[PDB]
Write a protein that binds this DNA or RNA. Structure first.
Ligand SMILES: Nc1nc2c(ncn2[C@@H]2O[C@H](COP(=O)(O)CP(=O)(O)OP(=O)(O)O)[C@@H](O)[C@H]2O)c(=O)[nH]1
Ligand SMILES: [K+]
Ligand SMILES: [Mg+2]
Ligand SMILES: [Mg+2]
Ligand SMILES: [Mg+2]
Ligand SMILES: [Mg+2]
Length: 592
DNA sequence: GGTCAGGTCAGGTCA
């Protein structure tokens, strides 16, 4: 059946004027207060919990323990992440039914269900609605994190930039009631406004879009020869060049916006008809040449480049950019190294003047964002030996590369992991499936690759560092899952935890070992399987020590094989958790 | 049973 209740406000319901006859009269006073609360002054200092304790009479809850149990899930909603869920069970289970006065008159057998129902009501009709009334939730796009802005200042931000967009031709109204492709959302991006579109779901045309994008990636393969895998690029470049590596990374400003629809349409028509049929060709071009979008119940045309959020703008922008930089890429200096994922260029060469020339070559052809550009060039004001590109960190001097992590200060790492799956729901009495499914290798698979475990251009100690960081991530995921077990499963009778923990350390060590042996490097000495597993456990402890009273049984059990080969490993790094992970917030508390 | 090939689901990466 269904054992999950979703935390997102999306599923909320607009409160009725009166209680529905099914629910008890008590709720109405809450409802009344809610209306009063909505009418109440919209003071900018606002805490959802305080206002919420006023509108909801405590008498509904009866005892303070019952009330606190309910406001715990309210707090969870205030601190929610995308896709997060709780068990519906938690809304009735372990509630002191003797305290609830209105329930006391009713027969005990029906008390849970009724309670459940009523609790459900108050969340969908009051809690989620009032939160949505005072606050607006926007995805940070860093993990599953959700930032809560005051509704007023978000509407002012979105309308400010909406007028800043109507004034310029970027957004016009074509006003012929043409069907909206999707709804435009404006979601803050530091300085930039990052305007995107949530397309409306179309299942009938989705296979056609997939066919189209497949054909376009095939024209990118057949023509404009693939630039090559970044791993082998870096490998051959570091092996062939012995001198100091000078490199620059540049971020194209509004890569999708500044594409020219006329040029891209006439480029789409250029494709030979056997690789793309002319009827399909015409579809591609009139799709991208006519982009119609619904804003505040109004429809507008988008005439600035490729609309972001489309199901065919990515492959098209790649087609455009890759064709457009063919001249440089086709033949450069044999010494030189260049690579672009999408909108992000990375160029390294022994000769500094060449890197300088490349910066100015790209800067003239396109308009860049100058804060995002990173280089070790002496002429630049803040040269760095470590340059970040494609979710990795390349140190040009050391020639070492390490996984890049994006953890702002005060960031709560629990956001990074999706523990709840509404399509495949685990019952509350099956904690083992939840914890296991959380610890399946697929989530860290990206970091268990050649790039991070190769020793061809990576030092052995840097291989150790990458694996240690990956295991730290795994452990934070484990701890988050444990908290989820305690918050919603609430299964106190749990001893299966250690089996999953140990099995996962074993298996991840095996995977990293098998990928490390396959991509043996010249810098490779001897790499223990045993001390790799031991490093996994020390990485765990670095995280579990953050909640040592709650975990002390487990951590003391862990301490009782940690045997660490080669003198280059400092070994201080493995005992103390890295500085990046020390300040991430592992306790959730309502900040609104 | 042991491979494959297709398909599906899942969680992660990049921009
Ligand atoms: N549909 C989506 N497209 C995206 C997403 N992220 C990036 N992109 C596309 O990748 C391109 C690069 O995005 P970036 O985040 O690097 C910033 P953008 O290039 O839009 O401009 P600047 O902020 O001036 O750097 C962007 O133009 C678009 C996404 O989450 N969804
Ligand atoms: K960016
Ligand atoms: Mg970028
Ligand atoms: Mg960009
Ligand atoms: Mg991660
Ligand atoms: Mg997915």
């Amino acid at each position: 059946m269904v054992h999950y209740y979703r935390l997102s406000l999306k599923s909320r319901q607009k409160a009725p004027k009166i209680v529905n006859s099914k629910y008890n009269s008590i709720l109405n006073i809450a409802l009344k207060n809610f209306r009063l609360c909505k009418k109440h002054k919209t003071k900018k200092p606002v805490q959802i919990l305080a206002l919420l304790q006023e509108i909801i009479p405590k008498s509904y809850f009866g005892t303070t323990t019952n009330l606190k149990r309910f406001y715990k899930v309210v707090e969870k909603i205030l601190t929610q992440s995308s896709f997060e869920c709780i068990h519906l069970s938690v809304l009735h289970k372990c509630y002191d039914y003797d305290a609830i006065p209105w329930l006391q008159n009713v027969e005990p057998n029906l008390r849970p269900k009724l309670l459940l129902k009523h609790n459900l009501f108050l969340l969908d009709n009051i809690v989620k609605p009032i939160i949505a009334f005072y606050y607006k939730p926007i995805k940070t796009l860093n993990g599953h994190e959700i930032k809560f802005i005051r509704k007023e200042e978000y509407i002012s931000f979105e309308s400010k930039v909406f007028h800043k967009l109507k004034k310029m031709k970027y957004l016009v109204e074509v006003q012929d009631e043409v069907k909206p492709r999707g709804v435009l959302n404006i979601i803050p991006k530091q300085d930039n406004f990052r305007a995107i579109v949530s397309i409306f779901p179309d299942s009938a045309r989705k296979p056609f879009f997939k066919l189209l994008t497949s054909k376009i990636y095939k024209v990118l393969e057949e023509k404009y020869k693939t630039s090559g895998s970044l791993y082998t690029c870096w490998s051959e470049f570091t092996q062939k060049t012995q001198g100091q590596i000078y490199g620059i990374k540049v971020d194209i400003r509004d890569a999708y916006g500044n594409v020219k629809i006329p040029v891209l349409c006439k480029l789409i028509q250029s494709i030979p008809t056997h690789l793309l049929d002319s009827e399909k060709k015409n579809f591609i071009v009139d799709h991208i040449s006519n982009q119609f979008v619904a804003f505040r119940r109004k429809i507008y045309k988008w005439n600035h480049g490729l609309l972001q959020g489309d199901p065919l703008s990515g492959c098209l922008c790649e087609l455009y950019m890759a064709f457009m930089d063919r001249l440089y890429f086709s033949n450069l200096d044999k010494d030189a190294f260049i690579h672009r994922t999408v909108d992000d260029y990375f160029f390294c060469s022994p000769h500094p003047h060449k890197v300088y020339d490349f910066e100015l070559l790209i800067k003239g052809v396109y308009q860049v964002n100058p804060t995002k550009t990173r280089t070790n060039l002496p002429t630049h004001r803040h040269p760095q030996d470590e340059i970040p590109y494609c979710g990795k960190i390349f140190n040009l001097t050391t020639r070492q590369v390490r996984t890049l992590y994006k953890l702002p200060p005060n960031y709560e790492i629990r956001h990074k992991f999706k523990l709840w799956n509404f399509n495949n729901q685990i019952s509350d009495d099956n904690p083992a499936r939840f914890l296991q499914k959380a610890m399946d290798f697929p989530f860290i698979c990206n970091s268990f690759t050649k790039f991070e475990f190769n020793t061809v251009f990576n030092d052995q100690r840097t291989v150790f560092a990458n694996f240690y960081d990956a295991m730290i991530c795994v452990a934070y995921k484990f701890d988050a899952a444990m908290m989820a077990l305690r918050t919603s499963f609430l299964v106190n009778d749990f001893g299966f935890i250690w089996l999953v923990l140990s099995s996962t350390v074993r298996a991840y060590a095996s995977r990293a070992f098998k990928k490390i042996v396959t991509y043996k490097g010249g810098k490779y000495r001897k790499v223990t399987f045993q001390c790799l597993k031991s490093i996994a456990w020390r990485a765990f402890l670095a995280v579990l020590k953050r909640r040592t009273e709650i975990y002390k049984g487990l951590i003391d059990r862990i301490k009782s094989k940690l045997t660490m080969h080669d003198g280059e490993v400092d070994a201080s790094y493995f005992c103390k958790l890295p500085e990046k992970f020390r300040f991430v917030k592992i306790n959730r508390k309502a900040s609104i």
